[PDB]
Write a protein that binds this ligand. Structure first.
Ligand SMILES: O=C(O)[C@H]1O[C@@H](Oc2ccc([N+](=O)[O-])cc2)[C@H](O)[C@@H](O)[C@@H]1O
Ligand SMILES: O=C(O)[C@H]1O[C@@H](Oc2ccc([N+](=O)[O-])cc2)[C@H](O)[C@@H](O)[C@@H]1O
Lengths: 192, 192
């Protein structure tokens, strides 16, 4: 599977594209630079990624997948609120260049309608899973009943990316009051 | 004041730089492009802005100032929570290119320690005003007493930029549940 070509080559290209985009931004990175960084000729590269847009699309889908691993399945062994607090803390401990690239894509999205639509699909898929977990907690009497789950998930996502986008978030999350304060915020959101 | 040179020229340059940065990003915009966009020769431009960094510094200070206008003075005629809900809604109705540029600077900050420090100064100045308003509400029995005001302001700022960075925020804020849901989130944050 993961060791059957062209998957290794594709993933290597994506690693090189992730590094170029994170260091210099999407706009200023050319395909030639990605060729030079990945050691792949234009011919080979274009067989696997015909455009810069195809590369960022695959990256956004990877980011989407990482987010879904947290919420795809029903929670077992932790309350919803506690899990969300821990998830936000974990966000701050992730690969820094990966976080830098998430913000770069957010920025490109504001000025690139094609990238914005990719992010809309991403947030939709994450929101769906969050609402699914809000439903479980509600059916188990964990969260309030009169909660706009869709809007709550959108606002949780906003807070999450705001934290992801703040260079001092890893330091903030070292403080116990980050968890404590975030918990009051989220229990109010989900009316606990 | 505002009509005494070089202020008009400086502000025109900043408008042109705001547009170039928002449309193409900070990294890919050269001073020559800013010269061409503002109609100012390199000589004149460099007298007022010696570097790209000087331009983004002035822009960040403008953004900082806009934020402080909301929280610099004690609130009169509205509760803290209601004011914060309305502030977040207003954020979604602001100049779109201005919002795009805020996110671009957030992105550059992740990968440019010099820009990150500018943003640290910005958030510090905004946090100070928020804490000042949290203090007033607390002395007036409006918000809870056991609130980490510093951490609460940091997390409010994160949510605010997360909303500012979401292209669908203007649509979300057209829904009454955006205000309602945001209000529960913030009353939990400030333990009301
Ligand atoms: O979406 C993304 O780009 C990021 O998602 C993160 O997971 C989430 C955790 C909590 C919430 N939340 O509380 O809303 C949303 C998402 C992944 O850890 C990160 O690798 C990825 O970059
Ligand atoms: O900081 C910034 O760049 C932005 O600040 C905005 O004002 C704020 C409102 C509410 C909160 N909050 O609830 O934390 C923080 C800031 C200005 O409307 C916007 O023009 C500027 O771009």
């Amino acid at each position: 599977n993961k060791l059957t070509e062209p998957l290794p080559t594709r993933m290597r290209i994506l690693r090189a594209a992730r590094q170029c985009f994170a260091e210099n931004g999407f706009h200023s990175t050319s395909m030639k630079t990605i060729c030079k960084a990945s050691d792949m000729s234009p011919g080979t590269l274009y067989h696997h990624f015909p455009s810069k847009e195809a590369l960022i699309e695959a990256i956004i889908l990877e980011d989407q997948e990482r987010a879904l691993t947290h919420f795809r399945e029903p929670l077992e062994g932790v309350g919803l609120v506690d899990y969300l607090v821990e998830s936000t803390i974990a966000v701050t401990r992730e690969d820094y260049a990966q976080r830098a690239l998430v913000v770069e894509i957010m920025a490109e999205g504001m000025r690139n309608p094609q990238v914005a639509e990719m992010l809309t699909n991403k947030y939709h898929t994450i929101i769906a899973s969050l609402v699914a977990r809000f439903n479980d907690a509600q059916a188990k009497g964990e969260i309030g009943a009169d909660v706009d789950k869709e809007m709550a998930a959108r606002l949780l996502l906003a807070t999450t990316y705001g934290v992801l986008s703040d260079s001092s978030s890893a330091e903030n999350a070292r403080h116990v009051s980050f968890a404590t304060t975030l918990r009051t915020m989220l229990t109010g959101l989900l009316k606990c």
